[model samples]
Target: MNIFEMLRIDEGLRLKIYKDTEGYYTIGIGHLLTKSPSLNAAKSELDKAIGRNTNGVITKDEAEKLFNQDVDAAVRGILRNAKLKPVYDSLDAVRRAALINMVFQMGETGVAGFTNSLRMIQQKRWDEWAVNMAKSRWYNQTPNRAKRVITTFRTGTWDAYK
Candidate 1:
């Protein structure tokens, strides 16, 4: 016989719909469902699934897990910045803890930006240091208020009003 007859003989000439082990929609005269799902596939059917609502959004726990990873990175930066270590280490226990608290908020580089303030701190000049801190952008942003972190130039309290 010809190839047509050969194919018909080898791959049964049935024209009805059928569902195999994987429940794949198949209908043909030959072995239409030639290959099985995948040898290394996570979800074969999901590949054909729709988007958006089909997968939905991530869970709160997953979001928090990502946030936790970011926090770890920011914390690592605190020690990585060589410039901030000395400035922080020079402070006493209370001030060091306060510096630690600010390190995470602004990163070490952010702490290093206080040009004049950092100089005054280096010189151990608490004399009119609050005026020096008040001259910075950080102080400008939050003025006439519960200035806690900004007052660090003057070695103010570790914290301020809640």
Candidate 2:
């Protein structure tokens, strides 16, 4: 399935579809805090508190420009920066998908900032990583969000979001 479909954007969740100069559409979830109509704008404001990279408070017109740009490089850059190689190298395809979903929601910097969890993963402590996964700042700040992602990661079932 396509990334947007996997993210369940068609299920009525508010989504910001970014169209770059090339007319490609990249979809991202709209954060409740943003109150912005475009993904770029929402992400920019969200990044301030979350400490991640974004286009810096883009306008709706900029959103139109984003849709045409190739977002694959950006998404890959996010994953690469997070040092996802360990998780990506160890996980099955389904789990990889779950990891990517989590990474997308929490950016590379956000995930890498998870010191304890990263340490556990580095030590090849799968069990500890599993436990720490739900105990990190990302999970603590957003219980429901953690639950959703953890459910998917554990079960490889996409219905966890529901």
**For candidate 2, what is the TM-score?**
0.53
Candidate 2 off by > 4 Å: 9-12, 15-28, 31-74, 119-127, 159-162
lDDT of 1 at 120: 71
Error of 2 at 38 (Å): 15
List all candidate RMSDs to the true structure: 26.0, 9.3
The sequence of per-residue lDDT tens digits that candidate 2 reaches over residues 1-162 is 444455444222323444422243343332233434565665555455335454444344443233223234335754566466665676666666666666555656766677776666556565556776876766786676577667666666677655
* 10 residues in a row with least lDDT, candidate 1: 47-56
> The CA-based lDDT of model 2 is what?
0.54
lDDT agreement with native, every candidate: 0.45, 0.54
1-162, model 1: which lDDT tens digit per residue? 222222223223323334433354332322222244442221222222222221222333433343344345544665576766676567665455445444433456777776676667667787656666677664565453314544433564533422
